[PDB]
Design a binder for this molecule. Sequence first.
Ligand SMILES: [Cl-]
Ligand SMILES: [Mg+2]
Length: 109
Amino acid sequence: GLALRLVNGDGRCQGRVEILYRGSWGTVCDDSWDTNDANVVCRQLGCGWAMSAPGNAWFGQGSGPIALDDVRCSGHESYLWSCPHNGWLSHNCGHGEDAGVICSATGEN
Ligand SMILES: [Cl-]
Ligand SMILES: [Mg+2]
């Protein structure tokens, strides 16, 4: 069962992006980690909208195989794994590129 979390931030609605894929939490190393991408993360978590998308392991480096690399959300999607992307677990990037998000945390549902 796919799941998403933001870790090592100040609260549920900010931190390093991690996706539960086939039993292990994996990070995102997108070098075009954009507002549209972050907005999808925030919507999916019920965390409002993306105030910023901190880059390059701002919230620290994750560990283990990296789940997603080039994720190109339109910005409307309900889940990050619904955005166009260039594959699971097939990436040469390092955890120094792990993406992060800071959401408004203005959701109530
Ligand atoms: Cl980051
Ligand atoms: Mg992107």
